mmCIF file of N, CA and C and ligand atoms in Angstrom:
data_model
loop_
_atom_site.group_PDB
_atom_site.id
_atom_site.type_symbol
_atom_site.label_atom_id
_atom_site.label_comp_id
_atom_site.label_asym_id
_atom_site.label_seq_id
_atom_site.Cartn_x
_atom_site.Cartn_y
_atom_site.Cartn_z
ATOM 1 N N UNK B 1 -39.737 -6.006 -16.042
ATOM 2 C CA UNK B 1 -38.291 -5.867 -15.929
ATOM 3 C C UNK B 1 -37.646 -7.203 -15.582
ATOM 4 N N UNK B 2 -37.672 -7.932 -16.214
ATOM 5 C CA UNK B 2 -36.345 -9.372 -16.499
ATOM 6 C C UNK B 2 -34.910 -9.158 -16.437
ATOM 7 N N UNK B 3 -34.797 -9.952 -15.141
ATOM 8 C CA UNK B 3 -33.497 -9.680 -14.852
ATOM 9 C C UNK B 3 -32.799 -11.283 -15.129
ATOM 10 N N UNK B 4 -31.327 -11.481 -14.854
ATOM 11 C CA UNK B 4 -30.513 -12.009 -15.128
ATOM 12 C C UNK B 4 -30.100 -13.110 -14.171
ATOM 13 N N UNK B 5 -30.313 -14.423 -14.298
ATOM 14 C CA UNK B 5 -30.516 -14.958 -13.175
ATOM 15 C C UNK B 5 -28.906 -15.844 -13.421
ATOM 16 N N UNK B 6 -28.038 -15.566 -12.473
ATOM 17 C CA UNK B 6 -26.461 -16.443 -12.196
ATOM 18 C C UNK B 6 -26.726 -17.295 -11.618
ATOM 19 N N UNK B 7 -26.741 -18.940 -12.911
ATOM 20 C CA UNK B 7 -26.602 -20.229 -11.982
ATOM 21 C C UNK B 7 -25.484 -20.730 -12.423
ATOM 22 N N UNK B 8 -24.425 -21.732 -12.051
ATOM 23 C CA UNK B 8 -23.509 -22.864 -12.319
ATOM 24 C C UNK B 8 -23.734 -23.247 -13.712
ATOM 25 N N UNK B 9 -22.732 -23.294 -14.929
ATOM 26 C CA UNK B 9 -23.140 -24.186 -15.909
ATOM 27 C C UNK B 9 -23.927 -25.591 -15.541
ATOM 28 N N UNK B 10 -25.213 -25.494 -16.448
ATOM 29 C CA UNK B 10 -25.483 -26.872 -16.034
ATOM 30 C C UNK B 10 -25.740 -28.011 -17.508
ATOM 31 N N UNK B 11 -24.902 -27.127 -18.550
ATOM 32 C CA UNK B 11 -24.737 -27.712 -20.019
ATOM 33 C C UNK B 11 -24.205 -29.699 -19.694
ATOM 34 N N UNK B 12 -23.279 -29.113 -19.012
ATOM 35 C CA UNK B 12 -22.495 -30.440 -18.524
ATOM 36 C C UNK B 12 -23.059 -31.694 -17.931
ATOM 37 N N UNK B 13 -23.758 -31.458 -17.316
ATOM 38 C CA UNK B 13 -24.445 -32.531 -16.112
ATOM 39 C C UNK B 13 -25.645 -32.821 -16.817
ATOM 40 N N UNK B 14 -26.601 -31.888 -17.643
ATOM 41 C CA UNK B 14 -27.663 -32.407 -18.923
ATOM 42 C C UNK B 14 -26.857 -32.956 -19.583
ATOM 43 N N UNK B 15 -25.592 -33.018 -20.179
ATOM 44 C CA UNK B 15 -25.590 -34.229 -21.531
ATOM 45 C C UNK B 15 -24.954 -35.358 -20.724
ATOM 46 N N UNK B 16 -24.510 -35.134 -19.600
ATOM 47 C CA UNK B 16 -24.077 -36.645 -19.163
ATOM 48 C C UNK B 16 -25.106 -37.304 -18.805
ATOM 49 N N UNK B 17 -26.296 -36.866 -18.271
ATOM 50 C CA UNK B 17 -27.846 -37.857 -18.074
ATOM 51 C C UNK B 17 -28.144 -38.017 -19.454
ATOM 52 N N UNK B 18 -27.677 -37.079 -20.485
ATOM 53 C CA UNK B 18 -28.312 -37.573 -21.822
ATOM 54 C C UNK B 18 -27.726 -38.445 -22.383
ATOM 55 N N UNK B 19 -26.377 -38.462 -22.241
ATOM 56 C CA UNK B 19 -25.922 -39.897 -22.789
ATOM 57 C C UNK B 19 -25.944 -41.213 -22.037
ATOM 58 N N UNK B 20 -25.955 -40.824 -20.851
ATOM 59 C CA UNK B 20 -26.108 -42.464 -19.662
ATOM 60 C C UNK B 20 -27.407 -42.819 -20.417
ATOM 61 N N UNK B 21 -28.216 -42.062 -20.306
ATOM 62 C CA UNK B 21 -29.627 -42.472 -20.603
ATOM 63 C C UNK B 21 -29.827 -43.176 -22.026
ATOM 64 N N UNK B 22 -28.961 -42.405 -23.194
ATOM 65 C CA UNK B 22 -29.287 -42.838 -24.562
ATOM 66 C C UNK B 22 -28.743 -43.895 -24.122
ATOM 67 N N UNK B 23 -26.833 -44.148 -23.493
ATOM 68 C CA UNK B 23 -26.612 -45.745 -23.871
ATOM 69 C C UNK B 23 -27.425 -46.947 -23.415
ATOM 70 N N UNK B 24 -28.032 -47.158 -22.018
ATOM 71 C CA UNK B 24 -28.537 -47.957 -21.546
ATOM 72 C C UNK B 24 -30.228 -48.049 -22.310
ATOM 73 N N UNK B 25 -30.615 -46.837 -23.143
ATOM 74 C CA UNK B 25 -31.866 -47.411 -23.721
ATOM 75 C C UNK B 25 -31.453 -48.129 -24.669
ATOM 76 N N UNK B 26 -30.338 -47.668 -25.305
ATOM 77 C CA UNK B 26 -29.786 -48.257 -26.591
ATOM 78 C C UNK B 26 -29.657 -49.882 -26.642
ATOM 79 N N UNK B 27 -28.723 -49.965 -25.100
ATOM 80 C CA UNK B 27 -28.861 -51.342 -25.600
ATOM 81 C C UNK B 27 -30.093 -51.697 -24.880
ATOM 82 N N UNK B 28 -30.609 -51.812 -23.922
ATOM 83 C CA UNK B 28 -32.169 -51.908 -22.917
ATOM 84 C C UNK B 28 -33.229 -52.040 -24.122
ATOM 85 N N UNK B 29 -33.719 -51.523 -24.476
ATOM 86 C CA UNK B 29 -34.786 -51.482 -25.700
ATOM 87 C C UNK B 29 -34.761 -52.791 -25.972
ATOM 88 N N UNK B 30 -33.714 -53.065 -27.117
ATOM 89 C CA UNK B 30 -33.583 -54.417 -27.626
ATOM 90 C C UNK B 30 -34.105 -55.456 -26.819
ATOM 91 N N UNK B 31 -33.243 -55.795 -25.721
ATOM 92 C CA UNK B 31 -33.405 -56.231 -24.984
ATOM 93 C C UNK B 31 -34.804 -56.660 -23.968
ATOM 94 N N UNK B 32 -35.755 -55.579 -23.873
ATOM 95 C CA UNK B 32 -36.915 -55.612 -22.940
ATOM 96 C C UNK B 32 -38.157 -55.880 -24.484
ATOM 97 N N UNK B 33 -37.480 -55.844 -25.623
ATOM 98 C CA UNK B 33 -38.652 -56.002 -26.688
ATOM 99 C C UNK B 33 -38.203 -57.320 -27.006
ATOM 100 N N UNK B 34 -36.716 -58.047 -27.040
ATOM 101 C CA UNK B 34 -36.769 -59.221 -27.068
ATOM 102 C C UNK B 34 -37.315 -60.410 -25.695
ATOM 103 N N UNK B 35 -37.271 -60.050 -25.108
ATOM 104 C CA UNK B 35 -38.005 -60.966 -23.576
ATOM 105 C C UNK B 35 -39.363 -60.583 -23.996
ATOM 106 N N UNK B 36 -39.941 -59.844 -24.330
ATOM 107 C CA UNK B 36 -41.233 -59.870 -24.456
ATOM 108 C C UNK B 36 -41.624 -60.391 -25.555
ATOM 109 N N UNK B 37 -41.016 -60.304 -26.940
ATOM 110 C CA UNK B 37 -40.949 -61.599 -28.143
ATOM 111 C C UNK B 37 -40.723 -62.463 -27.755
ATOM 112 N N UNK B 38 -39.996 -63.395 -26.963
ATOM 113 C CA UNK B 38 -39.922 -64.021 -26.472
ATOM 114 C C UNK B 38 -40.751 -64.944 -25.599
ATOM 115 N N UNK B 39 -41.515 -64.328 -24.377
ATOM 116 C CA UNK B 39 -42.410 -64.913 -23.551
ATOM 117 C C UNK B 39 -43.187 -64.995 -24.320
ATOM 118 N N UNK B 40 -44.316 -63.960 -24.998
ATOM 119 C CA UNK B 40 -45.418 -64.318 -25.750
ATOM 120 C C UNK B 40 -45.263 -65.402 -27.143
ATOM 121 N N UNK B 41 -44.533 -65.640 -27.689
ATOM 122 C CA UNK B 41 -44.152 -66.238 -28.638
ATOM 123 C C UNK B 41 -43.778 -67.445 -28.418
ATOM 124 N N UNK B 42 -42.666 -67.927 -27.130
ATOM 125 C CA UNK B 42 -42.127 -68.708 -26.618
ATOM 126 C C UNK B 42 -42.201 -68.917 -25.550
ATOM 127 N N UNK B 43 -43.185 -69.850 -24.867
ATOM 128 C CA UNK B 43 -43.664 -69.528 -23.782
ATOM 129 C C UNK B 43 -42.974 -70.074 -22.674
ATOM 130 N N UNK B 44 -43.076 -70.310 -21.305
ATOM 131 C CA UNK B 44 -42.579 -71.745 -20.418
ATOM 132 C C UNK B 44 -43.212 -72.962 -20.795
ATOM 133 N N UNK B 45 -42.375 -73.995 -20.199
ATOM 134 C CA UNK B 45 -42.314 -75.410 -20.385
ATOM 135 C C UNK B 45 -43.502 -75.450 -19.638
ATOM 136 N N UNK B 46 -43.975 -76.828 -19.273
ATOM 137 C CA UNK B 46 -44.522 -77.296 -18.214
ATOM 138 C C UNK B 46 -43.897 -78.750 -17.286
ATOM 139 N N UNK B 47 -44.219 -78.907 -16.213
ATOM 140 C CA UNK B 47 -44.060 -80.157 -15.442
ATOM 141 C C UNK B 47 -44.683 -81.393 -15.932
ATOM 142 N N UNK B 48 -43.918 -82.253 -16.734
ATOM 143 C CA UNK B 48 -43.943 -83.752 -17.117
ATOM 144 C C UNK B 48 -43.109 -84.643 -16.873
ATOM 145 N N UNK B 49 -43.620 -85.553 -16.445
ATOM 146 C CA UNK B 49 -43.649 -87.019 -15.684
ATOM 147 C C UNK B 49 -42.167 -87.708 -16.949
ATOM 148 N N UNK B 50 -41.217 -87.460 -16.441
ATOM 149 C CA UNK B 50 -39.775 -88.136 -17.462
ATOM 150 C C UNK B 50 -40.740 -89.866 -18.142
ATOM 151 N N UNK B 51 -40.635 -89.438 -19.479
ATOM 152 C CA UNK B 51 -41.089 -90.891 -20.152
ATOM 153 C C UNK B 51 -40.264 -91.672 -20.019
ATOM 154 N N UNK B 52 -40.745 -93.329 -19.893
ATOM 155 C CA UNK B 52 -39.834 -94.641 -19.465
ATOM 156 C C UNK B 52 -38.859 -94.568 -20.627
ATOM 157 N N UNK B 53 -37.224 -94.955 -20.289
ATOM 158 C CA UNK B 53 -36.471 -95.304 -21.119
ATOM 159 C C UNK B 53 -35.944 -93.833 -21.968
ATOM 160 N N UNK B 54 -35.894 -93.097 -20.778
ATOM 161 C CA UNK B 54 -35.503 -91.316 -21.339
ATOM 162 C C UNK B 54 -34.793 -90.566 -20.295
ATOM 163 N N UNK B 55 -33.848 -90.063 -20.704
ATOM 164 C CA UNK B 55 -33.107 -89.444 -19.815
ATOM 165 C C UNK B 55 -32.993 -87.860 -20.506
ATOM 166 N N UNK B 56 -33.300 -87.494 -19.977
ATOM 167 C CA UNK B 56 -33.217 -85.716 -20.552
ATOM 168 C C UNK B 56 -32.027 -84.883 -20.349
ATOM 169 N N UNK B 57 -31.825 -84.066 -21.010
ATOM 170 C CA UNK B 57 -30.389 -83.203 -21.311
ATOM 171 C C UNK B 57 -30.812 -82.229 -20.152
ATOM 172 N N UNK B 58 -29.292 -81.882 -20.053
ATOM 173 C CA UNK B 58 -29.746 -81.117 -18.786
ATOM 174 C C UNK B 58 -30.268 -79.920 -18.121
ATOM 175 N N UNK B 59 -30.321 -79.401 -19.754
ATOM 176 C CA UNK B 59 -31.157 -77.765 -19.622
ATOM 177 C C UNK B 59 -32.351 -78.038 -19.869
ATOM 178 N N UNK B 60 -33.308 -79.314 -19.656
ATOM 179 C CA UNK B 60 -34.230 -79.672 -19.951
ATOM 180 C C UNK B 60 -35.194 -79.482 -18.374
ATOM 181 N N UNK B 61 -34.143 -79.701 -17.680
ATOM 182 C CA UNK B 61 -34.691 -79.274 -16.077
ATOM 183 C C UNK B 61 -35.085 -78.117 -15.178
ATOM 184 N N UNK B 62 -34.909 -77.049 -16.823
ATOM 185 C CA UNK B 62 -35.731 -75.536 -16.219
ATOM 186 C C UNK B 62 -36.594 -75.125 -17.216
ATOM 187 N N UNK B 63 -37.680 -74.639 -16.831
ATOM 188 C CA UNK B 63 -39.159 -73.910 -17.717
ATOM 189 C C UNK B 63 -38.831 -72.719 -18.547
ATOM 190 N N UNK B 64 -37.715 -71.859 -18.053
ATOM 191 C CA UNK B 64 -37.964 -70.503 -18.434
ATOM 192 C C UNK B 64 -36.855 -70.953 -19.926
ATOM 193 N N UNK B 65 -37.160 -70.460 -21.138
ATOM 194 C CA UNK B 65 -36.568 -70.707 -22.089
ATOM 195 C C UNK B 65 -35.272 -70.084 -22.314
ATOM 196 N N UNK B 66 -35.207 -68.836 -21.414
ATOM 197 C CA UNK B 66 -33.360 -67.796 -21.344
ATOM 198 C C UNK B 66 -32.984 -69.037 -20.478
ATOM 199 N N UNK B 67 -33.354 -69.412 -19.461
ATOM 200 C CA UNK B 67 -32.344 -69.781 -18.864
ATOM 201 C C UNK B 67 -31.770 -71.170 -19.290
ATOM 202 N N UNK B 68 -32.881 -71.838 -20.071
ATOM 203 C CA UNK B 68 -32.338 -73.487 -20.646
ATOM 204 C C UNK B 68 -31.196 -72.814 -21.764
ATOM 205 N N UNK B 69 -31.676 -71.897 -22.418
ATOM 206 C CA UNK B 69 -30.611 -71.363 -23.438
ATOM 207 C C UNK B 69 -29.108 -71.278 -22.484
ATOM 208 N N UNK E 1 -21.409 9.952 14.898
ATOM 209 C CA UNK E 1 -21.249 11.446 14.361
ATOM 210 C C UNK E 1 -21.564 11.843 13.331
ATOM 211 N N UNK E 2 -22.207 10.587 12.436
ATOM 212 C CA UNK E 2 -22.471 10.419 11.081
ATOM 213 C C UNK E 2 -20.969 10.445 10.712
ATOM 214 N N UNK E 3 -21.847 10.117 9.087
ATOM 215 C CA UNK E 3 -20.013 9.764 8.174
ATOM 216 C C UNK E 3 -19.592 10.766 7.993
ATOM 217 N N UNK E 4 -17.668 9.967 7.939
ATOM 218 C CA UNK E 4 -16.658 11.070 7.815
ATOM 219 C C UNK E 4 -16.399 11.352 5.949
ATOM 220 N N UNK E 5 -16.217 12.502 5.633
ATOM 221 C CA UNK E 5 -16.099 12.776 4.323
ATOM 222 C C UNK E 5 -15.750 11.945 3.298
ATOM 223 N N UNK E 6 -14.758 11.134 3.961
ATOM 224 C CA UNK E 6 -13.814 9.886 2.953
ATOM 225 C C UNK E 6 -14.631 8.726 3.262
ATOM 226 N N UNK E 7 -15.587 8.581 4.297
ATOM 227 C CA UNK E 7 -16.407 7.564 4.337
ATOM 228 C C UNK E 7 -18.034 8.014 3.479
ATOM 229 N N UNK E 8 -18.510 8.999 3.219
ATOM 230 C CA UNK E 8 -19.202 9.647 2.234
ATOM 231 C C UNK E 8 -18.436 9.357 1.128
ATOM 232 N N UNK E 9 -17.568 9.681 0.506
ATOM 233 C CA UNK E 9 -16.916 9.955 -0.630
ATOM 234 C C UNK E 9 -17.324 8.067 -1.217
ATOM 235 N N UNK E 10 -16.667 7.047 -0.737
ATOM 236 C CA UNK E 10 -16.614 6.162 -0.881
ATOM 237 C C UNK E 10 -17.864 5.247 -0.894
ATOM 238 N N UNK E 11 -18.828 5.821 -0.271
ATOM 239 C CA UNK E 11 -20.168 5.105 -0.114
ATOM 240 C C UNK E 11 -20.676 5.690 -1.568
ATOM 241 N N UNK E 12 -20.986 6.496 -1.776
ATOM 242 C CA UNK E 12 -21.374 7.393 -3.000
ATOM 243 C C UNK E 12 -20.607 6.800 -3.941
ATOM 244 N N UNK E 13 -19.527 6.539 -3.975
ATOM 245 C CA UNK E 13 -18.834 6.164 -5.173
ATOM 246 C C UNK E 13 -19.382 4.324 -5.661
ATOM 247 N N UNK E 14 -19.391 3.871 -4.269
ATOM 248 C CA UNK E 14 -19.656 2.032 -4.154
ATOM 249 C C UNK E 14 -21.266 2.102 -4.609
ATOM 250 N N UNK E 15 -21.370 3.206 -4.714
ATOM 251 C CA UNK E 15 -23.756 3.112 -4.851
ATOM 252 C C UNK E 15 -23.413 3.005 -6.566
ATOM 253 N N UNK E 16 -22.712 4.557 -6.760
ATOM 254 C CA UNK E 16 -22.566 4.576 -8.173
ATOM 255 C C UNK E 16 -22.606 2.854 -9.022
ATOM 256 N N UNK E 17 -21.538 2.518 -8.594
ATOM 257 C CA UNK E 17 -20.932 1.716 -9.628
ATOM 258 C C UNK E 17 -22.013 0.111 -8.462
ATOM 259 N N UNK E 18 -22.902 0.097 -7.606
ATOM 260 C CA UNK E 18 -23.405 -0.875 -7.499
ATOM 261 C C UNK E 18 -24.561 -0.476 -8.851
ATOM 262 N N UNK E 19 -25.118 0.159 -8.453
ATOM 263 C CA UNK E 19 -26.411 0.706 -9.064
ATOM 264 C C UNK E 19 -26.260 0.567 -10.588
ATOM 265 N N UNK E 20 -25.008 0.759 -11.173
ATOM 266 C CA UNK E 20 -24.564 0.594 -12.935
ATOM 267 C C UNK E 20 -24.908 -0.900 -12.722
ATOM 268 N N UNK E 21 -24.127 -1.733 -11.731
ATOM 269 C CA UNK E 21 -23.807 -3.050 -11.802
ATOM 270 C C UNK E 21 -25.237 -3.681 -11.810
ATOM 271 N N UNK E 22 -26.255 -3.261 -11.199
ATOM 272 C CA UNK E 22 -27.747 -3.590 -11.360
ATOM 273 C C UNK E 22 -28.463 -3.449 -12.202
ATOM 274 N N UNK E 23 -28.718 -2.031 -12.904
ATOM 275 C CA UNK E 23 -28.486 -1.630 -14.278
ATOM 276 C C UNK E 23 -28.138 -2.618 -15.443
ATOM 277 N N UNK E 24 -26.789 -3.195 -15.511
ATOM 278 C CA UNK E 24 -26.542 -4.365 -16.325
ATOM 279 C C UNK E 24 -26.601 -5.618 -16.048
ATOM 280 N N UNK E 25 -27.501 -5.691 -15.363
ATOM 281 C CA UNK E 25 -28.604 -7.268 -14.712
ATOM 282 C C UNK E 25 -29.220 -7.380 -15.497
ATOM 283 N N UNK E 26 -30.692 -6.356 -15.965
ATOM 284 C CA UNK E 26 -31.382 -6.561 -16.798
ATOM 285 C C UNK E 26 -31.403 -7.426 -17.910
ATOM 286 N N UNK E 27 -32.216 -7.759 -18.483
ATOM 287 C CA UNK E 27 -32.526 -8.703 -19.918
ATOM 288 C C UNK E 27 -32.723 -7.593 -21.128
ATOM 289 N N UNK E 28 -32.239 -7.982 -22.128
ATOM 290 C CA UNK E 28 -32.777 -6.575 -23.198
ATOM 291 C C UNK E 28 -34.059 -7.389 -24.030
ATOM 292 N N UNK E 29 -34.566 -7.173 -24.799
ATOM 293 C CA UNK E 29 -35.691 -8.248 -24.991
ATOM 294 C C UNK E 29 -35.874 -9.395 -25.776
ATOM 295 N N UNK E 30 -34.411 -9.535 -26.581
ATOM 296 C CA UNK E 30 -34.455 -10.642 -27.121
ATOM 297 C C UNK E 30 -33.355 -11.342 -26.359
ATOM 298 N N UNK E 31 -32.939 -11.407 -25.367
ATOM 299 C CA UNK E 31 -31.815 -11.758 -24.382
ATOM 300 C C UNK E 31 -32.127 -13.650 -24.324
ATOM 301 N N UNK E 32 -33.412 -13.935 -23.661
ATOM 302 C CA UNK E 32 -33.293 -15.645 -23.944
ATOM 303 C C UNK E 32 -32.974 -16.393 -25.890
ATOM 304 N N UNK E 33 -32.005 -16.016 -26.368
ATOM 305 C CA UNK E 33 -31.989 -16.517 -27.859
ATOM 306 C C UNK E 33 -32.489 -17.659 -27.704
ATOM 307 N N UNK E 34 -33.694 -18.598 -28.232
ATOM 308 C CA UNK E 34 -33.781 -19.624 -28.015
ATOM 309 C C UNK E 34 -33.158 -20.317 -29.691
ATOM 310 N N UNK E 35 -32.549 -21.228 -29.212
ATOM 311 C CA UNK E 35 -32.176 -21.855 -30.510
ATOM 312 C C UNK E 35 -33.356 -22.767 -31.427
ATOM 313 N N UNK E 36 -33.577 -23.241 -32.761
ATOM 314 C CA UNK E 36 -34.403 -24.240 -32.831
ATOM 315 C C UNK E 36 -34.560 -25.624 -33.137
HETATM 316 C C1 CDL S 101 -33.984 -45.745 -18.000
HETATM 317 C C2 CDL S 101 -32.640 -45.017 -17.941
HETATM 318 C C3 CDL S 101 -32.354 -44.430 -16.556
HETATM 319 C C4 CDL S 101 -31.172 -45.120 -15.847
HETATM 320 C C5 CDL S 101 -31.428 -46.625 -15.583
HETATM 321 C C6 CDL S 101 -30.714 -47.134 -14.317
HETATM 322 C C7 CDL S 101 -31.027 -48.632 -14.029
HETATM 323 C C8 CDL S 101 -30.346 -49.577 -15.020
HETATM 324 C C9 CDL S 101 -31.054 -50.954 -15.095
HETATM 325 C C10 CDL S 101 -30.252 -51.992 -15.911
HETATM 326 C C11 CDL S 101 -31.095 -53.219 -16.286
HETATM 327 C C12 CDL S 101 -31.986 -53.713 -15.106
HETATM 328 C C13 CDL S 101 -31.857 -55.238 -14.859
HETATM 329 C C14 CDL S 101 -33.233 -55.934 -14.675
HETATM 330 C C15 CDL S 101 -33.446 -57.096 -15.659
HETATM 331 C C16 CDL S 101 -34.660 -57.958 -15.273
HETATM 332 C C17 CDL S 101 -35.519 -58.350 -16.483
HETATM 333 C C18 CDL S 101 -36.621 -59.368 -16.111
HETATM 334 O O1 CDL S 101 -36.323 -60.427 -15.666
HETATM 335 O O2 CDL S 101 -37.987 -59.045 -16.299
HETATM 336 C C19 CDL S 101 -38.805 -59.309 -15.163
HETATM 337 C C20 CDL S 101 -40.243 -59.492 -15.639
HETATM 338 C C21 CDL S 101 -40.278 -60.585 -16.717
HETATM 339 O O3 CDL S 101 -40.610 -61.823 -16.100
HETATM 340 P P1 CDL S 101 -40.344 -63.237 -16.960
HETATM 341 O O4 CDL S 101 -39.702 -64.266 -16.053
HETATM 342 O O5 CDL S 101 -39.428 -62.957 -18.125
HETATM 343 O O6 CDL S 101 -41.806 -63.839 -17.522
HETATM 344 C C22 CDL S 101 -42.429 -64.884 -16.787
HETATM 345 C C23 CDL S 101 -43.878 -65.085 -17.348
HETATM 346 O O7 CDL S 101 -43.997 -66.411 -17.771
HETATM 347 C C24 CDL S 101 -44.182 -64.170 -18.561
HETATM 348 O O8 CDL S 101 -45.537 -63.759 -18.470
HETATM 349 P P2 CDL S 101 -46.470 -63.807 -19.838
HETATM 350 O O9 CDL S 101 -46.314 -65.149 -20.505
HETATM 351 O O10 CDL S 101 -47.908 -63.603 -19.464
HETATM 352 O O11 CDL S 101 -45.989 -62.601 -20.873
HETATM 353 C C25 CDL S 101 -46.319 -61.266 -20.532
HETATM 354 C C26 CDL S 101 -45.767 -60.338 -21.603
HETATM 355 C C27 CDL S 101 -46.936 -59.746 -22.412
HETATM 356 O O12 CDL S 101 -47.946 -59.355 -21.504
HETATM 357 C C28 CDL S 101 -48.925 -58.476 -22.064
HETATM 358 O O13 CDL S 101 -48.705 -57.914 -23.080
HETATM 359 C C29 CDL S 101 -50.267 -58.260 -21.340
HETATM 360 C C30 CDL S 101 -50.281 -56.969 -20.527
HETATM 361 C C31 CDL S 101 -51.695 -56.566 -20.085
HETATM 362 C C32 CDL S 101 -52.422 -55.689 -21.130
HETATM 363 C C33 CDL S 101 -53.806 -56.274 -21.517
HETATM 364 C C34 CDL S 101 -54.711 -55.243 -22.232
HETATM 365 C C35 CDL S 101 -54.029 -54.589 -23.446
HETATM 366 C C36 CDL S 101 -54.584 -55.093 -24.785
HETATM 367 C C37 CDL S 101 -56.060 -55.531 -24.695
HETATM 368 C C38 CDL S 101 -57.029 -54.456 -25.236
HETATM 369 C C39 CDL S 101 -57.291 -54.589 -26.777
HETATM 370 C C40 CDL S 101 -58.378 -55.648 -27.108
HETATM 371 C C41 CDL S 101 -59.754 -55.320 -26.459
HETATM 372 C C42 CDL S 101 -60.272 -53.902 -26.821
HETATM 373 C C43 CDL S 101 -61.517 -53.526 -26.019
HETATM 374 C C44 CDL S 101 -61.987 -52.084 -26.293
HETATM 375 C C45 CDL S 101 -62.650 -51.450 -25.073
HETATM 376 O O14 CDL S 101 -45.053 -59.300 -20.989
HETATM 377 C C46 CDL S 101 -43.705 -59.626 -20.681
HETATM 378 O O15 CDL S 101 -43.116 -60.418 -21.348
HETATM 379 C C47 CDL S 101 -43.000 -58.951 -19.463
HETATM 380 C C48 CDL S 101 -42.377 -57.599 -19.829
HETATM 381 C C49 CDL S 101 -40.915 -57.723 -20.248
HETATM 382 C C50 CDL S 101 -40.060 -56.558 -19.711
HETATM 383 C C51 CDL S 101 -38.612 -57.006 -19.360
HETATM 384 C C52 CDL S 101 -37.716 -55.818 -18.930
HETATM 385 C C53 CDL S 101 -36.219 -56.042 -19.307
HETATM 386 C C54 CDL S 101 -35.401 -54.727 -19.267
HETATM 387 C C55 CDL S 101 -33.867 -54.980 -19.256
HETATM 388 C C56 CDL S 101 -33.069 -53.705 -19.613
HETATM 389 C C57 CDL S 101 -33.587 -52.465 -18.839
HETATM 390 C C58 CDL S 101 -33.057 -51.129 -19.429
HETATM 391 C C59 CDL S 101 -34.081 -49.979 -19.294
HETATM 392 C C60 CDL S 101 -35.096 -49.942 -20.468
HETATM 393 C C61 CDL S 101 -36.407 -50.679 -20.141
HETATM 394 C C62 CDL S 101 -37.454 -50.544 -21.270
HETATM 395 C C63 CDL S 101 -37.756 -49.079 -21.609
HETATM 396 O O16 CDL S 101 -40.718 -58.286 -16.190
HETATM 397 C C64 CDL S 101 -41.428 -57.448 -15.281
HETATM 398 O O17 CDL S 101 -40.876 -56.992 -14.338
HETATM 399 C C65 CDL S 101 -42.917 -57.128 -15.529
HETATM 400 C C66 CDL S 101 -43.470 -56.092 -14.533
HETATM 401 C C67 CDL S 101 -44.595 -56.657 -13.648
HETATM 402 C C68 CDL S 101 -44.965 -55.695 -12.498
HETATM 403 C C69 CDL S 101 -46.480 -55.463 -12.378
HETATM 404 C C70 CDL S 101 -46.819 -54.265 -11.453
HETATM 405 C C71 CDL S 101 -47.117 -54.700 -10.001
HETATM 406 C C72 CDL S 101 -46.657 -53.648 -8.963
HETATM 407 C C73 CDL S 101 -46.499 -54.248 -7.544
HETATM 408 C C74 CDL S 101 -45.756 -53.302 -6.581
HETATM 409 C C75 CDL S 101 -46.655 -52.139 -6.079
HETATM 410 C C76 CDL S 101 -45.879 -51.099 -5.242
HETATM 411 C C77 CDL S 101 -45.587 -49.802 -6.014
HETATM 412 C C78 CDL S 101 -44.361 -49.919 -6.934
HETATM 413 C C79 CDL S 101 -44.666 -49.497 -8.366
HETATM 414 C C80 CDL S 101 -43.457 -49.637 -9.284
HETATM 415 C C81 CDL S 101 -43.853 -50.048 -10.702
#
């Protein structure tokens, strides 16, 4: 004997987690698959000794390649 | 003194119509429609 169980609509509050969720994967995805194309592909710099008669640009003074960008 | 007639009358009447109201609680058996 199945009875009838009275809760609060909860249609409402599932599609608003469903859409917060779709937008931020939407753009997130891209994003966490490009940093990872990125690092493996494009890796960090390393620490070298400025060659005589060279002055370097100035995004030349950080390793991580987003942030010289 | 136990109940007075109009307090009988009214209890009997509030069972009736709880007891329907429980009655149409139930599920009939295809009651969850699931969509697909
Ligand atoms: C979700 C919706 C719900 C609502 C959401 C609400 C919140 C909204 C959030 C909004 C956005 C958030 C803002 C944050 C942005 C920050 C991004 C960032 O900077 O990235 C940081 C960082 C990237 O650092 P980096 O500076 O870019 O790289 C520097 C290195 O040079 C690089 O190192 P590398 O050169 O070695 O390269 C490694 C490379 C590749 O490495 C590998 O592949 C190797 C891995 C090992 C596997 C090896 C074996 C597998 C294959 C071998 C087997 C096959 C062959 C042999 C077969 C044998 C057969 C038996 O991997 C990577 O590149 C790093 C991963 C990149 C992920 C970046 C994430 C960005 C997301 C931004 C948007 C977020 C939106 C949400 C969506 C997110 C995505 C769904 O990424 C990480 O955090 C990595 C996680 C590391 C954690 C390790 C776990 C340790 C746990 C310790 C704590 C323990 C306590 C318990 C806690 C447990 C909790 C987990």
């Amino acid at each position: 004997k199945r009875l009838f169980i009275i809760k609060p609509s909860g249609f409402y509050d599932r599609r608003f987690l469903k859409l917060m969720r779709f937008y931020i994967l939407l753009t997130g995805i891209p994003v966490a698959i490009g940093i990872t194309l990125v690092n493996v592909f494009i890796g960090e710099a390393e620490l070298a000794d400025i060659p005589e008669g060279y002055v370097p640009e100035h995004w030349e003074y950080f390793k991580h390649p987003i942030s010289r960008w | 003194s136990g109940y007075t007639p109009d307090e009988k009358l009214r209890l009997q009447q509030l069972r009736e119509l709880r007891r329907r109201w429980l009655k149409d609680q139930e599920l009939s058996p295809r009651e969850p429609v699931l969509p697909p």
